[PDB]
Each structure stands twice: as C-alpha cells, then as structure tokens.
Amino acid sequence: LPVSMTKTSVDCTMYICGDSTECSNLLLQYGSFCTQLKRALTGIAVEQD
Amino acid sequence: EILDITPCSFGGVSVITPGTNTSNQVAVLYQGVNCTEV
C-alpha cells in the first residue's frame, strides 16, 4: 500500500522567468497566482508528512 | 573554450520563527546548499 509520495515545491518566479528582473515586473501584474500554487504545494507536502 | 552557463548560484530559502507574540529571533535555512558556499 502506498503511503506517501514525493514532496515537491516550485519557485514561481524562477520557473516562469528565470533571472530576468523586468519579466518578474511583468509577473507582478498577474497577482497572486504564484502564492496560490505555493500554498497548494505546501499543503501537499505537509499532508504527506 | 566551453563555458558552463551555471545559473547564478540559485537556491530556496526558508525562515524558522516562533510566534512574534513570543519572541523575535529567527533562523534561516538554505535547502540544497552546503554552507561553506555562503
């Protein structure tokens, strides 16, 4: 019986843009998508624990 | 000559803290980083 799976986390800014600063400036226009994804992944990790 | 385009040393950060109602000190965790390199 499987019990837990891999705990993973995403860095939204580095994934979407990498290391371009003005691209992150453009991301600032998209609101709290990254926060939502981070919260979901953190919930998944604590759920696995 | 070949130049490894290593991404500028990148790594995740995480702050361990008790409630501000209790104290103010914090601890910092750099996961995936050997801290002879910080």
Binding site: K7, T8, C12 | G12
Partner: peptide, 20 residues
C-alpha cells in the same frame, strides 16, 4: 533494493531509520 529550475524535492520529515 527492489525499488529505485525552481523545482525542489523536499526530503521527508521521517528518515528510513525512524520508520524502520
């Protein structure tokens, strides 16, 4: 033995020794 870019694989809280 029989089982083998902004993305990080967080280690589990409980090590294999603790579960064992």
């Amino acid at each position: 033995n029989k089982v083998t870019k902004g993305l990080t694989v967080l280690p589990p809280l409980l090590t294999d020794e603790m579960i064992a």
